[PDB]
Amino acid sequence: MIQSQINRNIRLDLADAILLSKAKKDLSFAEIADGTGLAEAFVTAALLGQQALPADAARLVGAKLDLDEDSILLLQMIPLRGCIDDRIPTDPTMFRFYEMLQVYGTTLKALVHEKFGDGIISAINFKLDVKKVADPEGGERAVITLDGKYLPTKPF
Amino acid sequence: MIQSQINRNIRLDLADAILLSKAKKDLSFAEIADGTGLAEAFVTAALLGQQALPADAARLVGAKLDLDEDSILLLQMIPLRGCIDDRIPTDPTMFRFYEMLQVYGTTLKALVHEKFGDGIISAINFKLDVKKVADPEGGERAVITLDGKYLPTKPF
Amino acid sequence: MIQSQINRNIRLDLADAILLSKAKKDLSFAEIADGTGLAEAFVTAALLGQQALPADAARLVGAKLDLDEDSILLLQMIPLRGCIDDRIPTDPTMFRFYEMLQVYGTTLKALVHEKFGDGIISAINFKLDVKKVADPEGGERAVITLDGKYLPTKPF
Amino acid sequence: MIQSQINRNIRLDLADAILLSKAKKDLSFAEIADGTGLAEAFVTAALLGQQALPADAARLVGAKLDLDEDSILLLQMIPLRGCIDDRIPTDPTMFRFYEMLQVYGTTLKALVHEKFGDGIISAINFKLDVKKVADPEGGERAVITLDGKYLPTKPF
Amino acid sequence: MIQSQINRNIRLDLADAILLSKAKKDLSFAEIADGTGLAEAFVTAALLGQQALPADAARLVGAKLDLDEDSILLLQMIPLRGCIDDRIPTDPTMFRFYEMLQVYGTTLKALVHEKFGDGIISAINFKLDVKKVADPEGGERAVITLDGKYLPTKPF
Amino acid sequence: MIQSQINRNIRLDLADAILLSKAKKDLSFAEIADGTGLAEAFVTAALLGQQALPADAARLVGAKLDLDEDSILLLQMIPLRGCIDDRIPTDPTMFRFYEMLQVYGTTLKALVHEKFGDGIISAINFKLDVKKVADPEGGERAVITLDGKYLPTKPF
Amino acid sequence: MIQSQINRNIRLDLADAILLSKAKKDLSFAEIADGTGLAEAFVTAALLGQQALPADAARLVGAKLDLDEDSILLLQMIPLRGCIDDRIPTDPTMFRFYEMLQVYGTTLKALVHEKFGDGIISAINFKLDVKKVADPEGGERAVITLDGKYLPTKPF
Amino acid sequence: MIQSQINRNIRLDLADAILLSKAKKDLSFAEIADGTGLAEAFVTAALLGQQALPADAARLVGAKLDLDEDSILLLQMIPLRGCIDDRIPTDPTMFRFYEMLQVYGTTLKALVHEKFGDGIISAINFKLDVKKVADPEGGERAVITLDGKYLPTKPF
Amino acid sequence: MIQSQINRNIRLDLADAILLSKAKKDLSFAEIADGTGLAEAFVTAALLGQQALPADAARLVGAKLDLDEDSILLLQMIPLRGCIDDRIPTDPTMFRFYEMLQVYGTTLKALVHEKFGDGIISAINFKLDVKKVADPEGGERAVITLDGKYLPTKPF
Amino acid sequence: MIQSQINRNIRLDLADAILLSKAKKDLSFAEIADGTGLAEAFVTAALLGQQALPADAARLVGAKLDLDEDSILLLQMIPLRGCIDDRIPTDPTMFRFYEMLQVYGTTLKALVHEKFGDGIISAINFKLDVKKVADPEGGERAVITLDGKYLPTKPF
């Protein structure tokens, strides 16, 4: 039977414990996700309290991280989502993503309406991924692809 | 000589006037940007107060929208950026992007550090674009590509 | 060509002007919406800056309210939505709906997950209506129906 | 003698304990409410810290969840209600209900005044329920019914 | 037909204009409410944007204050209520009432539940009045009487 | 020697322990205050962290509730007052008193100045009480009397 | 008949006009208050929207500053007090006084209770003054005297 | 070697411990400061986490209060200052000093600039003291003296 | 006679007008400050509402910018300082300086206490300058020098 | 394998423990950083939770402070940065740096755009240092040097 959380702190505390274990075992997110059949972004978000793992996957990562039974069970709960501590990120790495919205949020709205119509790009029927690409001018770039379903707003 | 703004409301008020003129003329952002040599995302962000147009681009869009000289000048000023009224968008369309961060913000941090290292993905050495594509399951999707330079954090 | 707003105050100021004309003509929202082919809640939300009217509906309500051409065009724009002035309503009538969420928000989450699964009830693929009904014990009740599509959150 | 709480964290900590026991026993909210004679939304809200259980219901759910005597006692206390952590939900599922108010809040006020008169729809003489209905286009919908008494505001 | 507002500033702007006219004519709230058949507290609240006046009361105060037709119409609209500028009063006089709640709010909760049961004392089925009384120790006291209906919270 | 607190959580934690003891013993606030010679509103406020009890009353209530010596000492400390968790109550029962201020705050200011003059109604030279009165139309009402000294603001 | 304000912006806008007139006439606060019979801190507070002038003083300062009749009348209104724009001062000069409270606020509470008892030092039965005094080590110091009546909190 | 804190909670938790010890021993702040050579306001502020004691004073108060070695060491650390829990005091006693600034903050700015010039009155080169004195009209008053160095703002 | 402001918007509105004129005239901040004898950071801050110009400098810049007499007078007023619209900058350029404090703020405190002792580095007896320096690895760097007086916090 | 944190409190709690050990050993930050090959500002920032130490440095500071293995491991994790408890510092020493931005933030933006162009001064390709030097007029000054790469914002 599906089970859900209402207080984000239970899974975020579990995330901190997972990260300590992960660091002690010197493991990567890539290798933790390897073998689950699930995308690295999904598995990672789950460890970090923002997705639910199916049972087999929760047992697999729970074996790798030496997690107890309650922790393996918690990983299967649908989370009370929300990773930002207080609305605006304090961390530079997370903040740059918020700033992309402060600069382009209205442009995103305008071009979404122009290309699709009234409505939204979904954050639910949605996936993201992060790719590393060489910068021709030197160095590296991240290409983060946000891929969401258009849901129209129609008169009724 | 470069010129800069310190109060966002000047350019945001100009944006509202631009949008009224744009509606009266039944124009698209695509056609406004046409002939500028500049990406639709960039030109649109400028009209909306979040970027500066070069002089030639400003004259061009100014002619399309019947803008007075002061307005054309304002479009060239470096803006006081920040499109979100009060930190968290109230608009559903803009809000979904913020929600992508509430769900995936810590994952983005985690995978950026794993893939690149300590540091950030830049919001300055940076571009984005919006594409519409059919969903293989029926309907349409937006593919929003965020493309930023990795800047390392190193000890000193 | 679809046209969209980025600052809510343009449409909200128009709403105030609409309400004054509505009051001077002694009109109801029901009679304003009648003949548009559209639900009273949708048309009312449009007048109040939270939905866009199709052209014929905008011309029709604009005739009943004696709106100028700019106002009729503004009603056709996709709005920057958000009717609450500062996150928490001050008005008792609006506030009660917020309180229903303070009391039942977590129950709605829990029961949605149990009945449907992980994911959300859409506020986009969505309609609302307000029905007045006699209370069997005396007096009257409102039955407000929230009717939204279930969108699953699935692993990937 | 009736007993009441003044700090929501006591009952919210209890709710977290209850959800862990519920998950360990693989129980549903429907099974837990069944036999109490109380609506599932009402029982669920109580477990989650937002309603008080009568003594017999508290003993019945307490037995099902293997709760101690203090926990069964706490369930009978009148709570310090307020399920949202910090005013605006972070969780997408709960958030959608808040957005329905950001879009339709002023429409609800407007139509409530037109249909009933000055005053409010109560959040106290009030019930809600969640029903799953098939979407004729495919998929599922939730119909959430908010059913509240009208209380008039009258001159004095 | 009843008419309602959605932006408090329209009626609060009218209140400022009313207060200037009131001062120029050197009138009291007591005189203004006289003849209206309505309590001073209710008529005063309406002038200040927090209640609606019936049409005859509106015309009567409007004649006293020399108000134009749009102002007398505005006074009959159901207001978007909320007199506190930003949640916590800055004014000492108003602030003391807020501080009575900071000190006794949990006591009021506790004693309401003990005396009446779960539920609330209404702010809608409700009246207030202010009386001046001599203090036996010297000086004057305000006796402010809050009088609201108990509405029970019952299981269902 | 008088002793005072600077962090509300010490006394608020004690309040929660008091409420659990109170509930285990199935006591009322009326019976707790009985024999102290002090008003129920004052004694209740002290238990809930918002007043100090004189030593004799502290020992009396401490006996009834089986409190340890440090708890009885804590009850005699002058508190760091402030019962509302985060400025605006979340609990419906407490909230209604805040709404009475959102609706009538400016009327209270206006009528206080008119009846008494510039200055305030004190929240210090002050008492409150709660009475239950039958409603002639059916049901029950609370009459809450706020009774404060007028302190004038005078030029100097 | 006494008159009162409910929106601080009316007297704050008048303050800005007063300051521009004062600057044009190159006047000081000391010379504006001289001849009024009223303390410089009281007169200055009135000009700046935080106190009400008696009629003669209002006319006297109105003549010095060349104010119109509505402005002279406004100065006589009891203000909606609150000089800080948004809770915490942005201006360094005002900020230092807030910082004195962030450092010494709990010490002020502790020593007030120790010296006087439970209760407060009044902000109403209160005066302040600003004196300049040579610093023996060189330079100048301000001695700002806050002088308030003790009001006790007593059991009832 | 000087040592400094970065999280106020460590010293604020110590302040609570000190206050409990102080109450158990029935001590005054005046007695605690006696023999230190230091003003009661400075020593009290240190106990409450807002100042650092020199080693000899820390040992002396530590002996009076039976503090352990870690606590005596903590008292010598330079604090992360800030005694107000969340910007605006909830406590009536502390709040009145904040209200003094809401009423007189702009007057203090204005008169400081007139008497001294552009710049500030220091909160660092600064002392404060609290005196109790009889009110000639009956009762008691606090004279709180804020004594700070004028630091000019000069062009450069 | 020195003159001061109490509402930042008067000078910030002047700043926007200054910036439009500066742009129409294609002027740099460097050339506006040239001839004034004042550092470019100081003159620029004054234009932007954060410092006062001496009379001669105000007339000089007034001449270059074609400002009216009221504007030149306004420039000489001591401002109500605070350039950030709402606590945290929205603009990326400004925001990076805030982030420097989010990363190094506690290190600044720690190292100031270690090097100088308890107290502060002044923001009043203070100057700042901005230099452009070539980056040995290519491109350009800003070296921004913050230079402030240490004021000690000593016992008294 | 690189490891990262998502909740600042883990490393901030570690910082408090580090600071206690540091004080018990009477160490300076200069002495701690000595032998590490890294700048005092960088190593201090890491101890305080705002940078990551390379393994050799972590083991070395770990030996000096007698940290356990988990603690040495934690110091090598990439932090969730953000040292300011709640947006605006409460501590005077940290606050002065924030004030420097309230006074000069728009000047920094203006002069950066003039000297470099549209874009930013990086907080990532960035270093700072704190120097103590005598003030020619007596006393001591801090020279804090902010040194960041210019990254341009260019059309695309």
Ligand SMILES: O=C([O-])C(=O)[O-]
């Ligand atoms: O965002 C950036 O690119 C930065 O701060 O360096």
Ligand SMILES: O=C([O-])C(=O)[O-]
């Ligand atoms: O985000 C969504 O997909 C929605 O609300 O329908």
Ligand SMILES: O=C([O-])C(=O)[O-]
């Ligand atoms: O919500 C209610 O029912 C009320 O306030 O009367």
Ligand SMILES: O=C([O-])C(=O)[O-]
């Ligand atoms: O509330 C009060 O009584 C005061 O401030 O004087």
Ligand SMILES: O=C([O-])C(=O)[O-]
């Ligand atoms: O407050 C002070 O003394 C300062 O910042 O210079």
